[PDB]
């Protein structure tokens with residue numbers, strides 16, 4: 138379990154072989170391997186490597202779906 142700053146989390150953007158990580162409510166999830174997040178883009182509107190806590194409100198789903206993915210740390 139690591140502690141990520143947002144600057145560090147931005148590196149995990151799913152591009153050029155980098156893992157795709159997303160933060161939600163202080164926890165960082167590894168969503169690499171989810172075809173929804175490959176390339177670090179999520180259905181046009183969303184970028185990997187960010188805290189998307191607020192962004193979930195507009196999604197056609199809730200944060201429950203993050204549970205299938207490893208928590209790799211907390212966001213500063």
Ligand code: HEM
Nearest residue numbers: 159161171172173180182183189192193195196197202203
């Ligand atoms: C932005 C408002 C937004 C859209 C649009 C969106 C769509 C979406 C779809 C259509 C799926 C597939 C449904 C399924 O259960 O398989 C999906 C799946 C996941 N999403 Fe999403 N999503 C939007 C936003 C967000 C945000 C802001 C996060 C995280 C903070 C997020 C996360 C996920 C996760 C995790 C899944 C499941 C992936 C998988 O099972 O492989 N989405 N989303």
